[PDB]
Design a protein around this ligand. Structure first.
Ligand code: HEM
Ligand code: HEM
Ligand code: HEM
Ligand code: HEM
Lengths: 141, 145, 141, 145
């Protein structure tokens, strides 16, 4: 449960992302792959080279799911249902990876929204991504 | 942990870094984003609000000190262990800082570098700095390890 | 965020503890202090020696809180609100410590309920403790 | 790590441990309690239920191997690093197991020892063993550090 203040911050930030959401999700993946090479082990079927269309494509999907969570900040568990199943139950992604992607996401946003990325916005998004991660790692059974 | 090409890249980017500004912002955001960390900076006064925190002079002050530490490490990318051995005993043996926090500060600094350099802070450059903050955190936590 | 199966396992386990909750609370603290000395820094003015009436007393407080939690598995936030305020806002206990206490508590139970501490029970108690920890670390505000 | 005192305490107790037994239990509980670790043992067959895991022959056998590796380090408590070099290579370099998992297994082992020895597994004894699993975990993640 995010505060209403937190929710306003998320909504506002994602608002400025707007139409670049898909490009930021792709950039976030690329940064994750480069910074934390072990994350690459979850995509052995992917072409992981700079500018790959698989990564670009997957990035659009990640952004879409984040948009959906933003538009449903009140029922994350509900909104991210099949995603928890996939990640926790089918892929069995190690919880540590979620922290790596969150970080990659914050670095991307800070870089594109310097003015808007205030200590306060930072804290809110941090909390948002954590919640997201929590939901995605709830169904390990 | 840093290839020669990586070291060069990092070395050259650092030249543009305004340690003073960056340092205060990094320490400030840590206190704001991970509040349990304020437990260690009781003696700084008001940490009550993001505003009180970011603008607190001890914070800014202490932040530049931290960055100065980074720079020296930047100067000995081969002996972070030796470079930080004194700070390790301090943080660990005297302050009892959980080493997970060393990682949090390193990540926060990366976010700050990104916010401040935008476009220039590439995935590749970022990757290079991740290696750097990891080497510093490791070196600080060895009194534990 | 405990499945029905989890709640039944916790309820069952806590029921076996019965009147030893306080003693187990005390032994868990003792095991924590011994295994992870750094935790001792949060109790500056506590004789943390073996038999200290302060550890005893404190162990009884923790045990009470856990019982309260078990009886309110449907509303931990509401059940542990005052404690979140205390631990997170007031004491600013670093979140890593919750994991050390949780482990210490699992060691204690395992030691006293060998036949009841099945793999499934262990899994449920691990999740319960993590949930309790999540609430106590909720108001970092 | 361990003093001579602590070394002796731990060493003495280890002799009462049935590696076959405890090993299968520790590995089975790790897969059950932290299910994401199952991804590395997909090969082992049926791990679908708590019961499937605990009765898995491959789990019991592998569990034995693990405890044996534990037995050895007990014998080389001063150089865990070197004792575990080859394993550190398999786990990190080849499997890419996150080092936090090494800590999870160590803690599960301690829970299993507690369950099997009850009152014999005293706070002090536990404390000694925590130092050991900590040393084992560190030595294995060295290919990272
Ligand atoms: C913020 C957290 C995350 C979100 C919102 C997210 C979102 C998604 C989405 C939307 C998909 C595609 C599912 C579909 O539409 O079929 C997916 C699949 C996948 N995700 Fe994530 N994900 C997250 C974190 C992670 C992490 C941390 C990892 C591992 C490093 C990961 C690994 C994968 C893999 C391996 C797939 C399947 C790829 C495929 O389609 O072949 N995800 N995720
Ligand atoms: C990359 C990680 C870090 C580096 C490089 C670093 C470096 C430093 C430096 C250079 C000082 C100044 C010592 C002096 O006055 O000579 C210091 C002091 C201090 N640091 Fe850090 N630090 C780090 C992380 C942390 C964290 C995570 C915390 C706590 C949350 C922390 C808490 C403190 C405190 C409380 C002091 C005051 C020392 C004193 O003057 O008594 N540090 N650190
Ligand atoms: C499941 C986790 C925990 C539970 C249920 C719990 C429960 C409690 C309770 C019931 C109290 C007493 C409140 C009162 O009535 O005054 C308390 C106080 C306290 N707790 Fe915890 N606690 C937990 C975790 C921790 C951890 C991990 C630490 C630090 C390592 C910690 C440190 C403290 C301290 C320092 C106090 C105040 C002692 C005093 O000054 O009297 N707690 N806790
Ligand atoms: C104290 C920590 C650990 C120790 C001492 C340990 C020890 C061992 C040993 C002795 C082997 C057998 C190598 C051989 O065939 O001779 C092994 C292999 C293996 N370990 Fe671990 N291990 C630890 C933790 C982990 C963890 C946490 C995971 C995953 C979550 C893991 C995954 C594996 C896998 C998948 C194999 C090999 C299976 C195969 O190749 O058939 N280990 N480990």
């Amino acid at each position: 449960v995010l505060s209403a203040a937190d929710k306003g911050n998320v909504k506002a930030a994602w608002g400025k992302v707007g139409g670049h959401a898909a490009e930021y999700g792709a950039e976030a993946l690329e940064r994750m792959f480069l910074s934390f090479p072990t994350t690459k082990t979850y995509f052995p079927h992917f072409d992981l080279s700079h500018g790959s269309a698989q990564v670009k494509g997957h990035g659009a999907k990640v952004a879409a799911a984040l948009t959906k969570a933003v538009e449903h900040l009140d029922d994350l568990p509900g909104a991210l249902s099949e995603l928890s199943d996939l990640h926790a139950h089918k892929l069995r992604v190690d919880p540590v990876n979620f922290k790596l992607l969150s970080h990659s996401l914050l670095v991307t946003l800070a870089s594109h929204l310097p003015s808007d990325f205030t200590p306060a916005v930072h804290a809110s998004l941090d909390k948002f991504l954590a919640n997201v991660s929590t939901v995605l790692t709830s169904k390990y059974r | 942990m840093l290839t020669a090409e990586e070291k060069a890249a990092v070395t050259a980017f650092w030249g543009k870094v305004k340690v003073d500004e960056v340092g205060g912002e990094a320490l400030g955001r840590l206190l704001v984003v991970y509040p349990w960390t304020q437990r260690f900076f009781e003696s700084f006064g008001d940490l009550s609000t993001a505003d009180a925190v970011m603008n607190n002079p001890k914070v800014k002050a202490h932040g530049k000190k931290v960055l100065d530490s980074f720079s020296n490490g930047m100067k000995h990318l081969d002996d972070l262990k030796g470079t930080f051995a004194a700070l390790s005993e301090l943080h660990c043996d005297k302050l009892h800082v959980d080493p997970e926090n060393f990682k949090l500060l390193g990540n926060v600094l990366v976010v700050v570098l990104a916010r401040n350099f935008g476009k220039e802070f590439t995935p590749v450059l970022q990757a290079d700095f991740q290696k750097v903050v990891a080497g510093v955190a490791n070196a600080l936590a060895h009194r534990y390890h």
